[PDB]
Design a protein around this ligand. Structure first.
Ligand code: HDD
Ligand code: HDD
Ligand code: CA
Ligand code: CA
Lengths: 674, 353, 672
């Protein structure tokens, strides 16, 4: 355990104050048995003061989130492309901590809000902490860090009433999007299934920005980070995400926790696209522009190593809440580029920790500490935990023999700015005209989605735009969408009873790019951890027998089985009253239970509703035992439908059903615009 | 030093509070004020504030949380952590307990106890217990401070109070500020004394180790530096901190006249080979060597000449108590060391009538 | 008042720094058009620093909530019972600010979580700010403030993984409840419909503690505060609340904002039960015990005045997020009691504002300022907004002529402790044996609910307890429930596969008390603000006509009407895609839309029918204006709260009565 040294055990012993005096904490000291409480009660005041000051400010963005520890392992010695120590040998291992998050919502908002998602990774390297502060979407809304508060104010709740929570579905957000067309690319990503991932484990991570890899000889190359999930890509459908938000606000954090606890820690290949400095404007856009991806067709991925998360935190506040990432945590071998979005982030993440931590010594929190010695002349500040021996903390000095020594390209493995970097020209507050095409790449993205995937996106837009009250804003939205795709503008316009403006083909094209579609990404490469709900009954001892046999067979392949019945007993995990289709990736009814499909024990129609919801949301569904038509007919589920199963044999049922879990969603169950 | 955060609330079994209304309120203040200094609630985790025994409690989170707590059920009563941490009290776990004989009774009041009302008899007790020159120093402190008070009204109010302690104090203080003391009011006057509160009457110092001796010398005489060095050997063996002062630094000289002052010494010795300096130099302000000797004398310190027209120049009586003049190194050291124990020669200070 | 002076108007003008220098804020200053950003870009740094520091710590409890401004009006001169100046004359008006809230969840959690709810009121009186920091439930979980962090740690999410959000449905909470039986009374309230109110306007407010009214002659009486809703009592059903938590986390704050904007500001009668000091132990329990109510049968309510909320905040953060209530904000004429829960609160609320505000001058924030001058020797501290002219801020002084003067019972209308209060005995950390009955009052409360209401409470317990992993925790919970009621313990245990322990009759009894039932409180006294969803279609011009006709008729009665159809157009407010039954108090299908109730790319499969079916299942009045539909929905034509007409006027008379009835509880099954 990485932070063992800082752990506090309270599995034995007597209660003490923070200064080690044994005390009690259950009754206040009073003047008489029915008397007033005394000011001299220090036991009361120390305990309540602590409680009164437990909270710290939530993160200004990405407030809602969850973390875990793991390991990164290098696949090679990468000295040919970078000086980075953590990448300098085959099999070299570095501890990591990753936090995943939504972006807009406060603490306590729902995991399954439609949003961009954070994917922030710390590498505790032998040459310092290196953070990659990424998202699950490869492009960002805006092209200059200075616009960040405008973006965030617009998508956060309206500031008179603080409504709506964790949602872009309101006037101000769509007003900003329509007035600031740079937003289109990330908007199209967020309106796709990427806005509602099935789990943190089923999404990728992106650094977003172009960075540099820098070799010990000072030469550099431009890179993009892509963490490719070994679990596959998967999304919720919108209606499902909505119900989930209410039934289980903690869905993603629970999923991550459970996967780690079961020995199924999630994995990513940590990859880069690498290109030459000379290619900054070779691909049809500017590599300094964070609203653009490099299509995989122009630059393939190099797999650098393996990321695995395999240990849950011990105390969430101490580790997950207090972790303070910074793109300023950089190491020798890596450098920045002149992406004006990146440039401004460097400032913000150092400054914002003062707010969260309330003092300048936030790097001393166990979770933020490096795993190597610290030698500098930083001193004092509130919460100072070190006792510095060096009483001459200035450079240059002779009284401490010139120590600490300066580190740079030539001595002490110092960080150094890529020495080939230059600047030229007037000092300006001007936008590069190379940043000006806001629409071709959103269109490239939309073109790369399958037909049913494009429908889902259009439906997300119809959902949100329909909730915009201002007809002017709605009209301005259609103006921007129409620049990406006339068809999209027409189909969205239809839901809101406006007309799309006439086609404007300046940025239309039919090009496609690999690796961005969820629905087209193939069956999941593993079904371990997926959830199967077996709907059963206590009326029939045969229903519970089938359920037990099924459980045994599914659990063997690492599926997480929940048997549902009217009441709990041995072998039944959940009651119908607490069960919901959003709790499962697949739903099986045992034919012993056919009769269920009114009780004081659950709402009217609940068992059927679970099956029907599962079907409507595209999940694999079936009946096990041999008698199926009663259940399937009651549900209106066709017996020959794709992803609908019926077998007497447990072994045979499970083999078919398991293919359906891998396929994950049966998209033919969703209507398309004609 | 800067981060240590003391609290009278840091108490242990075997000690308890009393109903002293000053103590009572302090208990609140020291816990609260650490929030201001530390900027967050985890100030007891600063290394200087940490205890030297394990901590077991359900305090959690807060800015600057440096622990990682393993107990995931930090509430009492619990079964999920087996009832740990356990309550400590008079009969379990060596807990603190309030003295069980303590009671309260009566109305809930914002009233001062009448038993607190005598504000003047103990001030008088203290004053009575000081030596005459000690009483003079105190009168002179009050003369100094009260003379700086602009308001005539406040000065008069001050004399009213001083007068309830001692009419003589009020008379003597009044003399310096040009007002008349009010008439004697003997309600609280008495002649009683108490042991252990006087500094002057507390006797010679039990040790002289650490005390500082300034030896005023010159670079112009090789004899002067010789004498200095000889004294140094003797004085240093008795634990005294010796500083040889001359016009410029060199082997055996610690401090120039320019940076030297009598406030830096508990005793001052002139090596007689330096008499010339005491009679102008760009190396120190005019009359500096003499002024040091003169200040040391006026402030009651043991002063000496080792090798006496210096004493004339300084207007210091050869026969005065705590004034030394010997050619014998050993004899001088011996007598001067007695002077350092005596510490102050209080006969050098003028007294009211 | 101190608020208007601090309002900032940005409807015209050029962008400036915080020091008034005109600037831009859209592009960073760079060394060349594709170059690095410059450190000398102060426009960038001031803007981003402000953004970086926008957040403040959320409240330690009641982090999720919403506020409004209003007025309190006194009904009489109440000098006969209290010296309090805000109650000293018929018609005397006092501005107020109220914040409502849940209790356990963090600031972004759902309004419709099952929880105790806060109802905190500030009266900006002419003798200082007076706060009554209350809840929608009259009793609290614990009997000593020192246990507050234990309660809160146990109910809040498990601290290794921070799961679950805004819910008592987990092991630690039920472990605490079953180990600390004082919790039983509040637990039964929170497991009732009181844990899931229909809105902030449809719940009452309680001070919880016994306080004192103190007269100018020094005599005192014991009081309980009860703010009685003029809107009536109403709850959601649990399944509804769960769906609402996902479809509209902002449901209660939205409901409050909308009511105020439409000129339907909610009202309460501010009432007290008043009893003599001699009655502290006269009613069969201790009035110092905050887990106990005084039954209305023993002490009727006196109406003191009217509380109305009628103006929304201008900036949520500055007003609602920053309001810092304290029970230590007391005025002459009110006093505390020796309730050990109240006692410790007085400490906590002063201290915790240091955490939220980051400085000691939090009473200077406009929302926290009083409406009368401030004279004291409090000085300095971070964020000091005053320039004090008195250069001698100590008492006693002559240099400032003895000002400010001390105020007390005799001089300057000072606050004074009720002079009859005493203390006697050993200094103890002991619980009074008078506090020891933890079970009789929860039973009193349970007995006072209707059968269906009792069933909902059993079902809420079945739901939560079935989620507790630990078999030993579940057994301990049954032990405690059994001491309140054997029948509750039997019926709860049936769902969780355990046997209830044998009846222990020590605290059983059959007494009832008035005014605690929601289902029993009769029809709503008003239907203004209630929501009607009219399900229509763009496919038939008739359907849209019917909807428009119904709309004009319902809207005249102060009902909020939403016409729902496949796509938006004139006449249509919402699409089926965004519509849910949780958005309505009543649902009407116009029969021209019959066809929708048997696929489209414009909405999920079965959505129109599901809205109607959910609405029915949740006990709402439902109707068809103009057989196909009710048959499709499995809704019986003869059922109460089911309306079938052709005549719009008649439909309206009948449906409006159903909205007052509010819920049709006969649609919910009962235990055998
Ligand atoms: C100049 C302001 C600014 C800009 C332009 C961005 N961010 Fe940021 N980000 C912040 C300012 C910020 C912040 C206010 O400084 C936060 C809040 C808490 C923190 O540590 O930094 C933050 C938090 C934060 C987190 C949560 C980290 C955690 O889990 O603790 C993630 C994943 C990101 N951001 C990712 C991004 C990505 C992928 C961006 C576009 C490429 C981006 N941010 C642009
Ligand atoms: C000793 C600790 C303690 C105890 C025993 C209680 N509370 Fe409390 N309460 C707090 C400590 C606290 C607090 C930590 O001090 C809060 C958090 C933020 C604040 O201003 O005070 C608070 C917040 C708070 C709020 C939110 C106020 C707002 O909207 O800003 C309400 C309505 C209540 N409480 C009501 C109660 C009631 C009805 C209680 C039982 C009779 C109660 N509290 C017991
Ligand atoms: Ca808005
Ligand atoms: Ca738990």
């Amino acid at each position: 355990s990485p932070l063992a040294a800082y752990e506090v055990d309270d599995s034995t012993g007597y209660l003490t104050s923070d200064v080690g005096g044994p005390i009690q904490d259950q009754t206040s000291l009073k003047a008489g048995i029915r008397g007033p409480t005394l000011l001299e009660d220090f036991m009361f005041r120390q305990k309540i003061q602590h409680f009164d000051h437990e909270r710290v400010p939530e993160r200004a963005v990405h407030a809602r989130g969850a973390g875990a520890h793991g390991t990164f392992t290098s696949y090679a010695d990468w000295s040919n492309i970078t000086a980075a120590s953590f990448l300098n040998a085959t099999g070299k291992q570095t501890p990591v901590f990753v936090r995943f998050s939504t972006a807009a919502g406060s603490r306590g908002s729902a995991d399954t809000a439609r949003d961009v998602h954070g994917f922030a990774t710390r590498f505790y390297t032998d040459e310092g902490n290196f953070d990659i502060v990424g998202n699950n979407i490869p492009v960002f809304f805006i092209q200059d860090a200075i616009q960040f508060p405008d973006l965030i104010h617009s998508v956060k709740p309206r500031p008179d009433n603080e409504i709506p929570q964790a949602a872009t579905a309101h006037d101000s957000a769509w007003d900003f999007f329509s007035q600031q067309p740079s937003t289109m690319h990330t908007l199209f990503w967020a309106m796709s299934g990427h806005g509602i991932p099935r789990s943190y484990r089923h999404m990728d991570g992106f650094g977003v920005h172009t960075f540099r890899f820098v070799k010990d000889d000072g030469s550099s190359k431009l890179i993009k980070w892509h963490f490719k999930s070994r679990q596959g890509k998967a999304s919720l459908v919108w209606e499902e995400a909505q119900v989930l938000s209410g039934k289980n606000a903690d869905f993603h954090r629970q999923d991550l926790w459970d996967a780690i606890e079961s020995g199924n820690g999630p994995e990513w290949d940590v990859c880069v696209q690498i290109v030459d400095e000379s290619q900054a404007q070779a691909f049809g856009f500017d590599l300094l522009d964070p609203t653009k991806i490099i299509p995989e067709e122009y630059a393939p991925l190099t797999k650098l190593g393996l990321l695995k998360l395999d240990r849950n935190p011990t105390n969430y506040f101490a580790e997950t809440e207090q972790v303070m990432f910074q793109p300023g945590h950089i190491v020798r071998g890596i450098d920045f580029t002149e992406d004006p979005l990146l440039q401004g982030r460097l400032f913000s993440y150092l400054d914002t920790q003062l707010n969260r931590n309330g003092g300048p010594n936030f790097e001393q929190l166990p979770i933020n500490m490096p795993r190597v010695p610290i030698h500098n002349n930083n001193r004092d500040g509130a919460g100072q935990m070190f006792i510095h021996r060096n009483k001459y903390p200035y450079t240059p000095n002779t009284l401490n023999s010139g120590y600490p020594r300066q580190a740079n390209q030539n001595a002490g493995r110092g960080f150094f700015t890529a020495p080939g970097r230059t600047a030229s020209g007037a000092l300006v507050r001007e936008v590069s005209p190379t940043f000006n095409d806001h629409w071709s790449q959103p269109r490239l993205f939309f073109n790369s989605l399958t037909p049913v995937e494009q429908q889902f996106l259009v439906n997300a837009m119809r959902f949100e735009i329909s909730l915009v009250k201002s007809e002017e804003v709605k009209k301005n939205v259609l103006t921007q969408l129409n620049r990406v795709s006339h068809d999209v503008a027409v189909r969205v316009a239809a839901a809101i009873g406006l007309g799309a403006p006439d086609a404007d083909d300046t940025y239309y094209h039919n090009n496609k790019t690999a690796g961005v579609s969820i629905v087209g990404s193939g069956p999941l490469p593993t079904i371990k951890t997926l959830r199967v709900g077996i709907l059963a009954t206590t009326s029939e001892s045969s229903a519970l027998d089938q359920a037990a046999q099924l459980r045994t067979r599914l659990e063997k392949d690492g599926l997480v089985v929940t048997v549902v019945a009217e009441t709990l007993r041995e072998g039944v995990d959940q009651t119908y009253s607490t069960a919901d289709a959003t709790g499962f990736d697949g739903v099986v009814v045992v034919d012993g239970a056919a009769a269920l499909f009114s009780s004081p024990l659950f709402p009217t129609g609940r068992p059927l509703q679970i099956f029907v919801d599962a079907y409507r949301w595209g999940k694999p569904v079936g009946v096990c035992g041999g008698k199926s038509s009663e259940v399937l007919d009651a549900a209106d589920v066709p017996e020959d439908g794709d992803g609908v199963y019926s077998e007497e044999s447990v072994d045979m049922f499970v083999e078919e059903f398991e293919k359906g879990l891998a396929t994950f969603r049966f998209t033919d169950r969703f209507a398309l615009d004609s | 030093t800067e981060q240590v955060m003391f609290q009278p609330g840091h108490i242990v079994r075997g000690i308890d509070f009393t109903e002293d209304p000053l103590l009572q309120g302090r208990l609140f203040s020291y816990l609260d004020t650490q929030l201001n200094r530390n900027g967050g609630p985890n100030f007891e985790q600063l290394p200087i504030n940490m205890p030297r025994v394990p901590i077991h409690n359900n305090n959690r989170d807060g800015a600057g949380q440096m622990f990682i707590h393993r107990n995931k059920y930090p509430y009492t009563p619990n079964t999920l952590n087996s009832g740990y941490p356990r309550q400590a009290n008079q009969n379990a776990g060596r807990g603190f307990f309030t003295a069980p004989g303590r009671t309260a009774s009566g109305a809930l009041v914002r009233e001062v106890s009448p038993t607190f009302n005598d504000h003047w008899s103990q001030p008088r007790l203290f004053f009575n217990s000081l030596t005459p020159v000690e009483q003079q120093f105190l009168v002179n402190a009050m003369r100094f401070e009260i003379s700086l008070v602009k308001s005539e009204e406040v000065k008069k109010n001050v004399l009213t109070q001083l007068n309830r302690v001692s009419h003589d104090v009020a008379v003597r203080v009044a003399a310096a500020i040009g007002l008349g003391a009010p008439d004697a009011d003997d309600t609280y006057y008495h002649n009683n004394k108490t042991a252990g509160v006087s500094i002057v009457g507390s006797g010679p110092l039990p040790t002289i180790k650490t005390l500082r001796v300034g030896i005023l010398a010159t670079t112009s005489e090789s004899s002067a530096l010789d004498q200095a060095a000889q004294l140094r050997t003797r004085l240093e063996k008795d634990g005294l901190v010796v500083t040889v002062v001359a016009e410029t630094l060199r082997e055996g000289v610690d401090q120039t006249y320019s940076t030297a002052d009598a406030t830096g010494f508990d005793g001052v010795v002139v090596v007689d080979g330096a008499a010339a300096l005491f009679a102008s130099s760009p190396l120190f302000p005019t009359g500096r060597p003499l002024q040091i000797f003169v200040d040391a004398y006026r402030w009651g310190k043991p002063v000496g000449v080792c090798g006496s027209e210096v004493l004339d120049a300084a207007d210091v009586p050869e026969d005065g108590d705590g004034v030394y003049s010997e050619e014998s190194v050993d004899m001088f050291v011996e007598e001067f060391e007695k002077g350092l124990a005596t510490f102050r020669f209080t006969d050098r200070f003028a007294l009211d009538s």
